[PDB]
Symmetry: C4
Subunit: 388 residues, 4 copies
Amino acid sequence: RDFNNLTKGLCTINSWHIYGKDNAVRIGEDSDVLVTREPYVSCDPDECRFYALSQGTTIRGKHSNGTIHDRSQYRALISWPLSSPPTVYNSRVECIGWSSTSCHDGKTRMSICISGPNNNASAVIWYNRRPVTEINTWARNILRTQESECVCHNGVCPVVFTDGSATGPAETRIYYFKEGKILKWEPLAGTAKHIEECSCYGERAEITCTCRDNWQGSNRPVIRIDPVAMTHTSQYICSPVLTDNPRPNDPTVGKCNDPYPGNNNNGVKGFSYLDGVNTWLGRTISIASRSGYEMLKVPNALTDDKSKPTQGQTIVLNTDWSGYSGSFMDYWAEGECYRACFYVELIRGRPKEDKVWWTSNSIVSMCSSTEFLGQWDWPDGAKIEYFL
Amino acid sequence: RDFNNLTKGLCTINSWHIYGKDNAVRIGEDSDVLVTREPYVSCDPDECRFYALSQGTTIRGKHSNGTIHDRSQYRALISWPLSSPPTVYNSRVECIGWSSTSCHDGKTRMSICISGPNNNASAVIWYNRRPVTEINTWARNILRTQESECVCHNGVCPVVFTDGSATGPAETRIYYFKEGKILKWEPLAGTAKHIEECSCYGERAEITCTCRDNWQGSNRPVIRIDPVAMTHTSQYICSPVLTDNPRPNDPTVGKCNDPYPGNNNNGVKGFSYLDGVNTWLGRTISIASRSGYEMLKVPNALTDDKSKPTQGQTIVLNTDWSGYSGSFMDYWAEGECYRACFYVELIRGRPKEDKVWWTSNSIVSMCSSTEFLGQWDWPDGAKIEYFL
Amino acid sequence: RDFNNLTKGLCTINSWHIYGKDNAVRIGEDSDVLVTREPYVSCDPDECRFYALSQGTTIRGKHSNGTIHDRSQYRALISWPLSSPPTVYNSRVECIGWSSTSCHDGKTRMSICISGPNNNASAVIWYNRRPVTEINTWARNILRTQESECVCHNGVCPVVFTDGSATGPAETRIYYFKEGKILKWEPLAGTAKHIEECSCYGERAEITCTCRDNWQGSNRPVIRIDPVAMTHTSQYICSPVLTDNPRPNDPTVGKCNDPYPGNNNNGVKGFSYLDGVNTWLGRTISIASRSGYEMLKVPNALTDDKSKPTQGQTIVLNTDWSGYSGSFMDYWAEGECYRACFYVELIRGRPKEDKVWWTSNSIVSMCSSTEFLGQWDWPDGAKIEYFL
Amino acid sequence: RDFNNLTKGLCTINSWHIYGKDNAVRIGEDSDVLVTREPYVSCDPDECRFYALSQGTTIRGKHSNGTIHDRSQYRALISWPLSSPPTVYNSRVECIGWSSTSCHDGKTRMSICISGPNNNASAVIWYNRRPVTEINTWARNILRTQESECVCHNGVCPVVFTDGSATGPAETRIYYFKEGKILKWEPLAGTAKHIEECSCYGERAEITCTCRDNWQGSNRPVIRIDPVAMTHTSQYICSPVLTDNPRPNDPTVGKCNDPYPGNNNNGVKGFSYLDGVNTWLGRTISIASRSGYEMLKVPNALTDDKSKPTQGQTIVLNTDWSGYSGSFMDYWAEGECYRACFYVELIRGRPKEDKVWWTSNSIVSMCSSTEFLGQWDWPDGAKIEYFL
Ligand SMILES: *[C@@H]1O[C@H](CO)[C@@H](O[C@@H]2O[C@H](CO)[C@@H](O[C@@H]3O[C@H](CO[C@H]4O[C@H](CO)[C@@H](O)[C@H](O)[C@@H]4O)[C@@H](O)[C@H](O[C@H]4O[C@H](CO)[C@@H](O)[C@H](O)[C@@H]4O[C@H]4O[C@H](CO)[C@@H](O)[C@H](O)[C@@H]4O[C@H]4O[C@H](CO)[C@@H](O)[C@H](O)[C@@H]4O)[C@@H]3O)[C@H](O)[C@H]2NC(C)=O)[C@H](O)[C@H]1NC(C)=O
Ligand SMILES: *[C@@H]1O[C@H](CO)[C@@H](O[C@@H]2O[C@H](CO)[C@@H](O[C@@H]3O[C@H](CO[C@H]4O[C@H](CO)[C@@H](O)[C@H](O)[C@@H]4O)[C@@H](O)[C@H](O[C@H]4O[C@H](CO)[C@@H](O)[C@H](O)[C@@H]4O[C@H]4O[C@H](CO)[C@@H](O)[C@H](O)[C@@H]4O[C@H]4O[C@H](CO)[C@@H](O)[C@H](O)[C@@H]4O)[C@@H]3O)[C@H](O)[C@H]2NC(C)=O)[C@H](O)[C@H]1NC(C)=O
Ligand SMILES: *[C@@H]1O[C@H](CO)[C@@H](O[C@@H]2O[C@H](CO)[C@@H](O[C@@H]3O[C@H](CO[C@H]4O[C@H](CO)[C@@H](O)[C@H](O)[C@@H]4O)[C@@H](O)[C@H](O[C@H]4O[C@H](CO)[C@@H](O)[C@H](O)[C@@H]4O[C@H]4O[C@H](CO)[C@@H](O)[C@H](O)[C@@H]4O[C@H]4O[C@H](CO)[C@@H](O)[C@H](O)[C@@H]4O)[C@@H]3O)[C@H](O)[C@H]2NC(C)=O)[C@H](O)[C@H]1NC(C)=O
Ligand SMILES: *[C@@H]1O[C@H](CO)[C@@H](O[C@@H]2O[C@H](CO)[C@@H](O[C@@H]3O[C@H](CO[C@H]4O[C@H](CO)[C@@H](O)[C@H](O)[C@@H]4O)[C@@H](O)[C@H](O[C@H]4O[C@H](CO)[C@@H](O)[C@H](O)[C@@H]4O[C@H]4O[C@H](CO)[C@@H](O)[C@H](O)[C@@H]4O[C@H]4O[C@H](CO)[C@@H](O)[C@H](O)[C@@H]4O)[C@@H]3O)[C@H](O)[C@H]2NC(C)=O)[C@H](O)[C@H]1NC(C)=O
Ligand SMILES: *[C@@H]1O[C@H](CO)[C@@H](O[C@@H]2O[C@H](CO)[C@@H](O)[C@H](O)[C@H]2NC(C)=O)[C@H](O)[C@H]1NC(C)=O
Ligand SMILES: *[C@@H]1O[C@H](CO)[C@@H](O[C@@H]2O[C@H](CO)[C@@H](O)[C@H](O)[C@H]2NC(C)=O)[C@H](O)[C@H]1NC(C)=O
Ligand SMILES: CCC(CC)[C@H](NC(C)=O)[C@@H]1[C@H](O)[C@@H](C(=O)O)C[C@H]1NC(=N)N
Ligand SMILES: CCC(CC)[C@H](NC(C)=O)[C@@H]1[C@H](O)[C@@H](C(=O)O)C[C@H]1NC(=N)N
Ligand SMILES: CCC(CC)[C@H](NC(C)=O)[C@@H]1[C@H](O)[C@@H](C(=O)O)C[C@H]1NC(=N)N
Ligand SMILES: CCC(CC)[C@H](NC(C)=O)[C@@H]1[C@H](O)[C@@H](C(=O)O)C[C@H]1NC(=N)N
Ligand SMILES: [Ca+2]
Ligand SMILES: [Ca+2]
Ligand SMILES: [Ca+2]
Ligand SMILES: [Ca+2]
Ligand SMILES: [Ca+2]
């Protein structure tokens, strides 16, 4: 095998079609399904799988109580076959930790898991299913990473990490790995003022990441990385179609180089595909909570500060719970272009549904179509009342 | 690998022998078996598997309530090892949707799943386990397909779809796929007046499909496809041995080019092997409900409007529930001929057994023998009372 | 791969060492373990597995009630990894039926399953996991076979079947298969008067089978097959150490060419290794019931009508339940000789333990050692009281 | 494949990073997890797995009652995927017995299991998943072995066994196996006075084992083996940092060639990495019970009788239960040195937690880092109260 190179551009996105859905919470009501959160999807050259951070207990197990908590010693990055649920018996552990990222470079997979107490966390970088490199916390305040797949080009796989306050200036670093080893790292540059949980994709030798400004911005920061030069830039999506959550109502003009104000110290992982007129943004429908999900076609959203939608697609109704969302692509598919894909985490349980003592999620995932396909909505589908 | 070509004829069918049986409802009474319906069987060059549309819940799970419903967002095409039951832990999801078909072309497998609301459904065509092509609804009324395997010849795999009313004229199309891409499509032609759920098989470079005329006919429509010319014809099985359900009692003369009247707006997926004197038809024993199943040897059933049985075999007693049935063959077996095979869906639960709130099924499947073998009956075997 | 040839002799048996044990009934008390009976062991060139006839229900399932019954439509030959229990999720179905045999010829495996009502049963012969040949009942009275592995030599795999009364003269046939096809068959010849459930092994191009004379004999019939000439002989083990069950007490002189009288119309599957002074016989310890199990070294047991034990080994104490036993060997191991192996079925439930409504078993299996190893006893280990 | 040779030295150990953790007791509260004890980790050239002695029952099963017992007929050596829990459905049985060791030589794996009553136990040596050699008890008093991986060099895999009293002089033998056959064996020599459960690792063609002197010593015996000459030496870790348990408080001077007194007839399996200044010792934090676990850097611990710690790392808090610990390395990783790894058995249930009737454990495992990483503590995490 040779290292994969990002030689293709994105396919034209005219609509989104269903790709995978695991119905984990429904199925888990009466089967040994692990409690998870922070899911994502990632492809190898011969298979695509679902990934997530387990909580080290099943949903019906008594240890599900307290799983709203983010960072215990019982978490791990797990992967499992596309559209099956994450069960005790089919889930493969990639590494131990409570924050992760993973990607295949064309030869083998790199997986990164961070563990430890808030003031002394460390990242372990695995390559070919073996630990290769370790990185200690640099700001002693919850060293953390993407929560979705990284992207590689000619063996170089850039990864974005953050260490420091989630509600003020922090120390974000872009690491450039090759075979699990560090080639280089650099501090965040550009005009993004705070970075969290970047969702990335690659096309024509450039990696684009859409992140979460948890401090002040309701517009999303964007990091663009050149994996050959091992350099990057940062800015915000200029469009007035605001895509973080919670957020204020949409204005008529957005901000390109500063956080769009109105909501502080909160946010949600999200993503976008920024490709001129072929630009689509995801967002929750609600401006106040992680409810609903929609895709909006917003031509030149990255650079046009008055850009508005020209087409859309509802993914999850506003009467259903959503959550994190992120990008991935099958870089090893046939054809001349890369088909944009995304997943949405459908969070169930606490804190929105507090009649149960757990927090878990199911996954729904779509990929783009060049047809203009009809839309449906894709809820988690479980009845909370059954778990009481 | 090379594309498979339909170079052989059917073996002489002198009786049927047991091929597979999963006892899913019995086993599922105390194990994590998924609720399914619309099952089928399909072979790859190195393995044969059971397929079905999951309902995204186990049978003992509380989400089994309401699984008589046909088209939710929680359904998916799943496959699992021959004769094992469809469990949470052994079921592989092929695609998401509530109507499907799947077939191997000798190189890799094509799987098709349709999802969406009644007025805006779409088909996603997967090839080599990746989405390749998408087709939007053309009549905005439950775009739908076979519910059993398709058949390929030199890489061309024809598939029959229907969109429109189930109880009047509809728009049926025959699509010719190759590597998941559309080579051509054509509207139904011939004298069949309504087509649903075709069950197909191939021999000597011709594909024969036996379908369900849900509108007016109790005789079954037959579509014969030339996968090289990419053309087809349609008619009805001429025989007076009527094989849909419900249906009127058998007459002495059938109809070749029009629906045999007596029952409207209802039916059941079924199949036949139409090979001159080597012709065998399946049907429910009851004329009123999906109960029992038998195979009848009816020489020249396709073209002789007075043809009657010359031999038979009971598969399921009339005191046991049956359901959908369809054809498949192992195109990669050894020998000089293709051995005809079929499955019968054994439906349990609603609406016939309404003491339970679910609907599921188990599978029984047979293949032909050149011997004249003794017969047995093969019920689902589960006791409904145990689920109360 | 080439067909395996029986070129080696048996290793010297000086004691028996533990080979596998699944603890199925213990584990199945709280996990999804299938109810089985009539187990055996069989090796492929790269793996050895446990086999048995499932009853199509778990042990804790409500459908376990009534599993003392021998021949339902819900049975199947299943195989699973050595020493794991037969679970819903790890059990591979080989074929459907209530009587079986299976063996690997060095290239691929042949598996045979018989199904049907008592007066109309049929055998389906599978080869390379596909049905190849079918055989109809010839005496219309429970067509049946070995219940343990067959043995192959240069692709020829002889199999012993019986059809007819279990308590009087019956029609026993020896079939010679090659690639699942019938080369030849012949009626039983020699002085054995009734044959059931032969347990076979091969060495130096000769296959030896030890069977169950269910009609009159408490000594076991022996069939010796030449798989090149496709011919056989039959007689009884001459020794006065009687090895069927139930049986009368041991006399001082046995019978070579007639059934040793005392007990009629009953028996148990068993085995022996008949190799001059390297001869070892298995048997239940009790003369009245399937309780205990021991191995006895009885030099020249086949031909010496006064031969008595010169060494022994207890396998299962007389205060523990045993059941069927049979021979198998790993024909693909390293070294210059074939190591004799056997299994013992540890039956639990009915009819001996009727506080439960089911009948199942676990497996224990040993192979010979050239050392004189210490002995232990190997009970099933489950507590019936826990299942109440 | 070629036999692996121990050509590299140990990497510099500056801290320990998380490697694997299965959370088995937490997960097993509501899933079919086997009861185990005496776990370890061992790598093949393409995968690393967890190993343990099953008790042949799940933790929630009624047969979990009485699993404090060490040596039943229902135990077996099982292996399962790294960091998954040992479940009924994912656990592979390697051999049957109640004492084991296992290692890969670069070509295939050797696994050894001992079974039998106290006065008549025997070892069966498996190679390439087949039984090859058997060894009978030589002192008729619980023949027993390492309970952690063995190490191979150019196909020679030395294994340490003990037979005889656990509380006085016993007969310890070092066996040198190659392809499962005995090349040679020799009685223990040197100044170690009693040996149990050696934990071994290899580097630069030398194998170092740290053992448990159950009779008189609270310092640990050390056996150093030359696998080419097939010779060994023995002594004790000289350091005053005592690492068995229970043990007296640390003195200022230890003993090099005799047991450090204070505690008799008790101990716990443990390990060390003895590499000059790159020396790290593991031990329980408590001197009285199997509680807590810490790693201490003790330069020249093997040869310096006043050596004290210069650095440390807490693995398990003293308020959490620990248990056995042992060494393993991935001998097939990339790079120029071997990365030291270890596991800690986290024992739950009896005898410390007697509100439950079972005894089981979970596993935590770490490997060394050349960074100075922050530390966390890694408890089992299960709540005993949930099992009541
Ligand atoms: C069969 O399926 C097909 C295919 O899916 C169906 O056709 C689809 O129908 C969709 C629904 O109508 C449609 O999606 C909409 O597209 C609009 C763009 O098109 C229109 O404008 C362009 C540009 O002028 C024209 O060319 C075009 O012809 C249309 O006129 C979007 O504008 C739509 O999104 C907005 O509305 C929805 C509510 O429906 C909001 O959720 C969404 O966020 C957008 O509105 C908010 O945002 C904008 C931008 O800032 C504001 O201006 C606006 O006030 C809203 O703001 C409030 O709400 C947000 C969200 O809560 C909040 O943050 C903010 O603060 C404010 O409170 C929508 O995306 C598909 O494009 C169309 N597809 C095709 C190919 O046709 C067909 O209907 C189906 N058939 C049947 C029978 O069902
Ligand atoms: C051991 O096993 C062997 C092998 O299986 C057993 O032998 C099998 O025995 C079967 C049962 O007898 C037999 O199957 C029958 O075959 C008949 C054909 O053979 C006869 O006719 C030919 C032609 O003349 C002769 O050559 C031949 O020798 C025989 O005489 C079929 O006609 C049979 O089917 C009809 O009967 C069954 C009821 O038994 C119906 O369910 C079935 O649908 C058929 O009847 C309906 O349909 C016809 C056609 O329209 C009507 O004319 C008729 O009135 C019936 O219609 C009513 O019912 C239907 C269904 O509900 C409804 O739709 C309609 O409106 C009406 O209400 C049957 O198939 C096997 O061929 C035979 N095999 C061999 C190789 O011998 C042996 O018995 C076993 N041994 C033991 C001891 O058990
Ligand atoms: C550590 O482990 C080692 C290795 O396992 C242990 O050593 C083993 O010890 C075993 C038990 O003593 C021993 O097995 C016995 O071997 C006898 C043969 O050896 C003796 O005879 C020869 C020939 O003369 C001598 O060379 C030799 O030195 C000995 O003297 C067998 O004869 C034994 O079997 C008979 O006894 C058992 C009861 O113990 C019966 O269950 C068994 O069926 C045999 O007896 C019945 O059958 C014979 C034959 O017809 C009759 O003559 C007799 O009356 C019995 O019949 C009744 O019972 C049967 C069964 O219910 C019934 O059908 C019938 O109708 C009647 O009612 C036995 O096999 C191993 O050989 C020996 N191994 C070695 C290598 O030494 C050591 O003890 C262990 N250490 C500790 C400390 O435990
Ligand atoms: C972020 O993470 C980093 C990295 O992990 C954290 O930094 C680590 O901090 C650890 C805790 O302080 C530290 O570990 C200690 O290291 C000591 C060695 O360093 C000191 O001495 C050297 C040599 O002079 C200096 O160079 C160095 O600068 C330091 O001064 C060890 O000595 C420590 O172990 C002893 O203490 C612990 C209690 O903390 C005991 O459990 C342990 O067993 C040791 O003490 C017993 O044993 C000795 C030896 O016999 C006795 O002398 C002593 O009295 C104790 O004996 C009693 O207890 C034992 C055990 O119960 C019993 O058997 C006996 O009988 C007696 O009852 C300890 O290992 C790491 O090295 C350090 N790492 C780095 C790289 O810095 C940082 O803190 C984290 N940050 C935050 C904010 O949390
Ligand atoms: C991605 O591009 C790199 C860089 O050009 C390709 O790398 C070359 O691969 C060939 C084939 O193995 C080698 O002969 C060269 O030595 C490689 N290195 C360089 C720098 O040229 C790589 O093959 C490309 N990937 C694919 C899938 O084509
Ligand atoms: C078992 O013996 C048969 C018969 O001698 C061997 O068969 C020959 O195999 C070789 C190798 O494939 C062929 O060239 C011959 O044509 C085969 N047939 C005969 C009749 O000679 C077979 O190889 C032996 N099996 C093994 C494992 O050696
Ligand atoms: C404290 C910093 C937060 C990110 C901005 C926090 N990240 C981590 C590693 O803890 C996330 C946030 O608290 C949770 C959420 O917003 O859903 C998930 C939670 N993420 C994870 N548990 N992996
Ligand atoms: C409305 C059109 C019907 C076919 C003629 C209908 N098909 C679909 C896709 O919904 C089927 C029919 O209602 C059910 C049955 O007859 O058993 C199954 C049902 N089929 C599926 N759920 N896949
Ligand atoms: C009626 C003839 C019997 C053999 C001599 C009978 N065989 C079959 C195929 O039914 C066996 C016997 O009744 C049972 C037993 O003795 O344990 C098992 C039972 N065997 C099986 N259920 N496979
Ligand atoms: C009697 C000798 C003991 C070792 C010094 C004893 N070993 C065996 C094979 O029984 C161990 C000891 O009793 C137990 C413990 O200390 O945890 C485990 C127990 N080990 C095992 N059950 N495998
Ligand atoms: Ca924000
Ligand atoms: Ca109809
Ligand atoms: Ca359960
Ligand atoms: Ca008898
Ligand atoms: Ca000690």
